[PDB]
Amino acid sequence: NRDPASDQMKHWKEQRAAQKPDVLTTGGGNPVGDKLNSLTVGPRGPLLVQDVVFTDEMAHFDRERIPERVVHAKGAGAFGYFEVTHDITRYSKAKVFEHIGKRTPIAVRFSTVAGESGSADTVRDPRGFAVKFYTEDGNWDLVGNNTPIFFIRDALLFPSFIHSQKRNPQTHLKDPDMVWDFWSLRPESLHQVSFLFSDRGIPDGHRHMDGYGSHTFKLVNADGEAVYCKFHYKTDQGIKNLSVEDAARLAHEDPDYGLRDLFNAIATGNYPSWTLYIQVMTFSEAEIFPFNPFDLTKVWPHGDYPLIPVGKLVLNRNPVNYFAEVEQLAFDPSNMPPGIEPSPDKMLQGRLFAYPDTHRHRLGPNYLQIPVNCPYRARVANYQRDGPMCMMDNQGGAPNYYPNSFSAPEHQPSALEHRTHFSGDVQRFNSANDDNVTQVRTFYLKVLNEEQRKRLCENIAGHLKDAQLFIQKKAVKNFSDVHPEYGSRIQALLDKYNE
Amino acid sequence: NRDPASDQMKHWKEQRAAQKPDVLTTGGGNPVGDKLNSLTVGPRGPLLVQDVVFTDEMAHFDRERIPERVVHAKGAGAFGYFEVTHDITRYSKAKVFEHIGKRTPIAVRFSTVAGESGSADTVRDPRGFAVKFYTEDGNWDLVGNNTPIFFIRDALLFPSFIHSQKRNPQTHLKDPDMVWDFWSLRPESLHQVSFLFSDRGIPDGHRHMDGYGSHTFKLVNADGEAVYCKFHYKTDQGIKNLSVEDAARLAHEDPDYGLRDLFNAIATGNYPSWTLYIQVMTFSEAEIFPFNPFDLTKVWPHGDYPLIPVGKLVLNRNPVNYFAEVEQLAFDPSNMPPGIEPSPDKMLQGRLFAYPDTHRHRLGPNYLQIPVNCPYRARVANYQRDGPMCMMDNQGGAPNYYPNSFSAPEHQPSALEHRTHFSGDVQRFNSANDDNVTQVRTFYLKVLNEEQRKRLCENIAGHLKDAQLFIQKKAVKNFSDVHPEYGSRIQALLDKYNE
Amino acid sequence: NRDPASDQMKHWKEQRAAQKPDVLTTGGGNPVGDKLNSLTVGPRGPLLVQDVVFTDEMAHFDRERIPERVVHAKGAGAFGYFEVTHDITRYSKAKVFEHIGKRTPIAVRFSTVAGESGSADTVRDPRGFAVKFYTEDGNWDLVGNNTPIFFIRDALLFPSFIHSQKRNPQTHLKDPDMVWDFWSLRPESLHQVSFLFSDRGIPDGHRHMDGYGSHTFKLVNADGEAVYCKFHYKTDQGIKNLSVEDAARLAHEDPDYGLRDLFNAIATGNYPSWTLYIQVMTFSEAEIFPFNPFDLTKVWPHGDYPLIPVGKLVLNRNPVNYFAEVEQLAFDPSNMPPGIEPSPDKMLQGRLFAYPDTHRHRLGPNYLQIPVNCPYRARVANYQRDGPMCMMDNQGGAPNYYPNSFSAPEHQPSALEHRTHFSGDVQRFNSANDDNVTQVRTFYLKVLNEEQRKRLCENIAGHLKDAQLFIQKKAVKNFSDVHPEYGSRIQALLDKYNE
Amino acid sequence: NRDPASDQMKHWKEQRAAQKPDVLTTGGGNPVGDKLNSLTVGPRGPLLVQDVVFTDEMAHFDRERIPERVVHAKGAGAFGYFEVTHDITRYSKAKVFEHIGKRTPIAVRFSTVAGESGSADTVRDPRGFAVKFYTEDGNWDLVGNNTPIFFIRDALLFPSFIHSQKRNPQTHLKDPDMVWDFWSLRPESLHQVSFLFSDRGIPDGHRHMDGYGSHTFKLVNADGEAVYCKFHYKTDQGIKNLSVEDAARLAHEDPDYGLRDLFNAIATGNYPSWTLYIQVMTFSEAEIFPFNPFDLTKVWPHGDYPLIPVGKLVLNRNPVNYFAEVEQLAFDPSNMPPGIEPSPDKMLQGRLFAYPDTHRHRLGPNYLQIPVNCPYRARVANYQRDGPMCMMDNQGGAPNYYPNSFSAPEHQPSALEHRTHFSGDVQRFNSANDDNVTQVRTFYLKVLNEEQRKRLCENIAGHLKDAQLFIQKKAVKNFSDVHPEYGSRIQALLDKYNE
């Protein structure tokens, strides 16, 4: 017949079988003897307020929509697991790395960035690769992307950036002037901009790309010794990226390409997978590191920082109900069990606040009470109560104040943070010029070869060319700073475009 | 050693054997090492966004409150069950009345009307007596008051009325001028105003009061024969009211007098109960009734239409967590299973809409998904999906349109609403003059005794006194029309208060 | 220099030549010193909760999104005026037709139906054409589409219909099975299902299509004399539509082609306009009409019910802030001022409820207080108070109960709805068999030509081909019921599809 | 006639006289013909969905309530101005203090702490005194209290503290086992607990108590020099407290005693006023100072740190509409104009988040857009956009990303916050031991006389007399740790109650 995805309803009805159709009830459970004709006074008379089957049903349809994610709105999710294949415990004590073989159920959602709920997957844009570990020490949310770096290092420029990447406030259209006037004013973006306008800007499906945590993190062992790290989960399906024409086609032929590709892969048992590594780095080294170690616009070279294998990431279960399981999924970077802590990364720091904050608005104050979000492999005990849409028992009638004297939830000297030291005037430090060329330069010449460079510039040229001459100048100028050739090369194409 | 109530945390810590701790965790489930001292820079430095322990808890704290019931904000709840003791199947084919012995679990909520969440129980106001019958056909909400009548008979004046019974738009104080200027212009209230300022005006606890569905409903047997009815559930603890004096004392001595009573009663195994009856009135009779059988400001004389016993209401368990189980409840008059239907009672007609409406707002669209409100003894299946805070599995990946060729839920033609015939134009018919005195008089000089007759006139004059003069007259005028010795009695009383 | 839409920011900066930039402030107005670098404890230290500039901005960014329209999500809007050009004061006493030359401000929003916010503009799909008239008697929203009919005729099927027209509950992809299973089973759609798949399914922008009320409405004059009617507003720019070819190209080349088109036309002064006509069926004729006169899947042949000019609709003003002025925009079919009323059209009926309903959710309880939604050309005086995000003065300290003796607002007896008569039993009268082929046949034969019939069956087959065989069978069957030739062309052309 | 409050409507009519009342309309401005009788088919017939007048008004009524503040729900409000009478220019460069005689609009809401919206005004509970200053540098919210200290000095303890003061998790009643349990295990509260149970526990209205910025703040002049200060606003009407029985009866007599008292004062011309003072402490001194200068349970003595005069606070205007103006009022300690800055206070720091956070919950993302909260004497311009119920034009078509090259809002280097250098390990420094008795001892003995002292004990015992003996013991122990006779005295009383 057709793909497993397209055969959704069929398979469902068969798995049903002789079973008789459940009785069609109202939201309240009352049966409905006829849900196709409205209660009216006469066969051509008014609809009666009395028809509560209608109002019950209808009224729910009127509220079916919740706000889409402010970014990474378009995406698909799957459920699988994480299996430990190595002992990394000598660095981090996270009970999720306790011992080789220990499997931890995971949830994942891939996505793009700019486009809204109804956009196409096969477009150039970073890619969301969020992983949720339902550990026994609560939930670990590794909110990564398919890139190890980002366009900026100060959370303060995120809202502004995303704006420049979406629609003009008045026309509602995509604005090249917004996109570029911005990037041009913030060279610190050059690194990721490059990586973006390259063959990695449009990966062929989610199964054919890598996942990165970007931010520098922190691991704490048993003795309480800490280290900075980088999470890397390389794909076992091999890197496969799409072409401008192939994506441009798939944009209209099948805007949900990734979604369908992913569903089908797992639906046929062809489970995609990823290996997970890390990059350990001592505070002493971080002291020596040539760049800001917690600067999101940079990477920790493999040469000096080899990747240590941790375990495996398998996806083998497709969502049953997409809304209740994927749409509602919510990953909060602040969710790190004892053993994994954040790092002084300005960018990351801001995220600690943003995810639960927005979740409280997209899903609701009690979003953690949603199944897909609930840490079902841990016992939630604390002194928080009420809040709209409170499921479960609300910790019944246990003591809500802390401390107390009636045997209620307690501390955890073992689950204490790792104390590091910091000195310096508590102020706003201008991190504007922490070098926006070095790593971009190497990328451009070492990692890229001549044909890839050829593409990079045409890709940039085809978009940049729509911005205003002045922005273009400012833009090209920045590329030259990474390399005279980068500039002139793109410059060349532009003048052409301006036909 | 105090009452059961006061010894809440007590009995809790006790029954905790013999078992430690659960570990204090965040919402995510990550254990909290120390949650008594904010993570700060230096012993006298600022706060770190990095203290997600803090942010996480504070955040939740900032959202515990939700809008209180528009009306009937203050109250107590309890659970138990209902059981059949009489066969009325020759009247209604509802599964809740199946055969004698049939035990249907229930949830009940008592409350006041005008006062807010802070107000006290022990004051002059009607009382909210709502029953939630969790049946196999869905939930059946019997939303009723401590009286069989109300002040008005057209939903269009309820909001206006409920406004008059609350604070001044400007001062935020209770305003007698509002109350009585409204009552005066609408004599239909006479009947209920009288029942309000009568000894019944303030019961002693929720246990010593009666219950009523107030409105006229519809019953239909498995044979399709329908007949108008009126529910009645009298207390088995005997009717017991509270002197104006006591009420006021209790008012401030224990604003929550209603709660603890009801609570302890059950705690000390002394479970409350009421005797459910029904008044049956064929359509024929209804066509003959000297009054509108659907007028909320009227009663069915017991002599002409006696009470048939049908069952017992037993509240034998107290809520474990008030919020989750009582404040979060949801009673929907529209929730009537097969065998039970509404009547053209203009007020009821309005409640068919307003209740689910507000619930969606106070609690949220998926409020029927809240445990307390979910019909757990029915298989809720249909074509409704999503909505904010969507719990459950959202009915999985089942066909979502009706009709469908994939074995999704079918309709049960055995629950189709009863087919009645109405003839006449669609218009706004004035019920303002549907006799607002007759039944009132027969209640004054007939139901009440000279003794309690004077108490009434006193109670009324004490409030009416605070109203403007032009307000006081019109008011009396009405009473005068119920019986001269009624208005004159009050008037006289007024002039005295009037100095 | 490019199209006016592109230079949006240019002409802006250009717009305020003079004028010096405003000061960057927080939400509270507090002036911002440095908005680019967060306040960390040291150049490489953590983030301080003490940084309010951050939090303020971030917390807001995090809540920018609201639920998109449950249907007709992706749209475009404009403002202009409506002028009366003919006297139809004998049919309706509506103040908006009050006299030749009279101009009434209007707001308009065009749209697709199924696609979400990211979706492409140029796709086969009906098109929405909502007009809000800010008249003296309050607002009058005429919520029309680009077709005079619809797919169903009973609101209870609508939620289902849409569900089918959207993503699969599990895969989240578009399911043709769903689409055609629904249509195949509900033959009342044939009519619209045909129009839709005809060249009219993909209009060339919004400026090249007619607008219709679709529903039969009731007009009422000064003598209380009522008549039924149909609203039509034909484009003055000429009917123009895109070919499946260009339409599919534009889909990826310019997903917002409709937006960009409407903006530019206005931006350059080339204002689009439509002439509004109306048909008039007298209560008598409605009775002898060959079909049900309130059946949305039918039409009043120009032949027996000639169109009558009324005035002109002109759009000469682009939105300044899309979100605020278009996205937040809301239309309620229930918003009809004196002299204009509904018919018993089952579909129109449900609509009277659903729009104000959703708005109360998508926008919020007081959504009528949002600028674009406020009937600023009328004085809202009533007994409504409070609700979240309540602006203006909340009607100040005015009496909040009706009636009252304090001069608060009074009703207007000349706005009382025209009273009609209906008789019969109050029940769910089945309408699934009200002739779903006659008018459909006239379309396939008299309104189209061979060249066209060829494209239609080609367009139907293109999509339908993806539905299980048993489903196609069912569909072809229904087509044959309209005309043998019809089902064949599709069937044959289908057989070609199945290799 | 009676007082101004009682004659509210009476006056509204009079002044509003010589004017025909407004036409009653729907939310959409459509005039309603009859708003007293619903629309039904026939006199005793069902209600029609057709009746949108009904649904409109009802739907809005069903949504009047919003969540009440989590703390300080019961309060009263008013508006006035602030007048600088003295020059502290050398301390703060805050425009509010610019010159002598400089008037600035203000808003004020007084409140209790634990009691909900329906609770009574006169009870032992602190008092809220929030002053909203609408200055040119944005609004400055001085969220004070009627006391200078607080029960605790760490944020994490607050949500827990507040719980002990509110209802029980299950029985939902006020619980002394929690009240005292928390206070027992937490001896730092000793200072405020003594102050609370003192004569100052129940002020005779709001006009007879003082105001205290409570926390320690930082002031910055034009030359970047900072200093730590305390805000004081002494009552001009003099300190007048209510008796324990006077207040206890007034409780049920007049639950809105504070509300009325204030409304009338202003209403008759007797405007209440307060004098604003500032205590100043230099960093040097802040060094020698001998407990934590930021500890909230500690106060600066006028002795070594004298009270400097700053200006006047006068309230000469009542709210016209309570909901819109007082209920919707939102004060954010985080709102601080240039010249005013937080201080290391853990407590305060924590308040910097809760307030805006909870507001976005209780009121909505755009709460600052509600009139009374809007910083109208300032010019809001930034890069924040959209959000639900977005009022205004949303800043129109202005560029929305910063930095940009199109002349959008620029920043002010002048408003750059004062930089304070901090050193020390980053961890959760225990503050449970910072003297929880010294200052307190100086009250019971020095500040308090024999008389008051007698009741302080009596007041405490009277309450604590309901907690498990094992709790009482602890309580007394901490009191004696304050001073032998303190606990001893209490303990004595305790026994008599123990019966």
Ligand code: HEM
């Ligand atoms: C008879 C069944 C119908 C019902 C119950 C119904 C219901 C709805 C609902 C609940 C909304 C949603 C969006 C929002 O305001 O956020 C909506 C939007 C829309 N409907 Fe349908 N509708 C019906 C038929 C149609 C027809 C047949 C046309 C035209 C007369 C139409 C045109 C529109 C348009 C243009 C929008 C979105 C417009 C805007 O706010 O600018 N609808 N409808």
